[PDB]
Design a protein around this motif. Structure first.
Motif, PDB file in Angstrom:
ATOM      1  N   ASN A  61       0.861  -1.216   0.000  1.00 14.17           N
ATOM      2  CA  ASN A  61       0.000   0.000   0.000  1.00 14.17           C
ATOM      3  C   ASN A  61       0.884   1.249   0.000  1.00 14.17           C
ATOM      4  N   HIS A  62       1.567   1.505   1.082  1.00 15.63           N
ATOM      5  CA  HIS A  62       2.446   2.707   1.141  1.00 15.63           C
ATOM      6  C   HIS A  62       3.868   2.317   0.732  1.00 15.63           C
ATOM      7  N   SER A  72       4.833   2.368  11.563  1.00 14.83           N
ATOM      8  CA  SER A  72       3.573   1.585  11.417  1.00 14.83           C
ATOM      9  C   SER A  72       3.600   0.816  10.095  1.00 14.83           C
ATOM     10  N   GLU A  74       1.581  -1.219   6.934  1.00 17.51           N
ATOM     11  CA  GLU A  74       0.235  -1.227   6.295  1.00 17.51           C
ATOM     12  C   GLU A  74       0.208  -2.265   5.171  1.00 17.51           C
ATOM     13  N   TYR A  75       1.052  -3.256   5.246  1.00 15.22           N
ATOM     14  CA  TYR A  75       1.073  -4.298   4.181  1.00 15.22           C
ATOM     15  C   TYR A  75      -0.118  -5.242   4.368  1.00 15.22           C
ATOM     16  N   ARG A  76      -0.811  -5.558   3.307  1.00 15.87           N
ATOM     17  CA  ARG A  76      -1.981  -6.474   3.426  1.00 15.87           C
ATOM     18  C   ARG A  76      -2.612  -6.678   2.045  1.00 15.87           C
TER      19      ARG A  76
END
Length: 135
Positions: A61-62, A72, A74-76
């Motif tokens: 994602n980022h 933080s 945000e992998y998914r």
């Protein structure tokens, strides 16, 4: 909160691993196409997983961060859809490139994707019309 359908992808990416041989579903998994596919002539394709009827996709994602456990993560997974009442078509581009495929939804959109290869391109396209023949 009836995500009982979006909750399957999770148990589908971990309860069966990610390949194109073994299968855990009866007619909505068996990852008919575990590899990589893009969205038309894009420059940043994303991982893909065809469930002989479903269409899931994943991608950072980022972008990739310096390291996890710092700010933080945000992998998914990315997005998912239902590839069963859709049809994949072909175009007349040039073997040079642009030889992807254009599937269409029956609501008002078009599922056009493009594999970063020759067999990978005609590969997902066949895994779609392959289930239509019966499933």
């Amino acid at each position: 909160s009836k995500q009982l359908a979006i909750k399957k992808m999770n148990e589908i990416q971990k309860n069966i691993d990610g390949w194109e041989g073994k299968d855990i579903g009866q007619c909505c998994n068996e990852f008919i196409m575990e590899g990589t596919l893009t969205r038309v002539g894009a420059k940043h394709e994303r991982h893909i997983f065809l469930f002989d009827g479903l269409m899931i996709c994943c991608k950072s994602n980022h972008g990739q961060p310096r390291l996890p456990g710092a700010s933080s993560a945000e992998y998914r997974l990315k997005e998912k859809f239902f590839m069963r009442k859709v049809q994949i078509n072909d175009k007349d581009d040039t073997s040079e490139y642009k030889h992807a495929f254009e599937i269409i939804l029956k609501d008002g959109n078009s599922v056009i994707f493009s594999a970063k290869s020759a067999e990978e391109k005609n590969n997902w396209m066949a895994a779609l019309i392959s289930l239509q023949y019966r499933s």
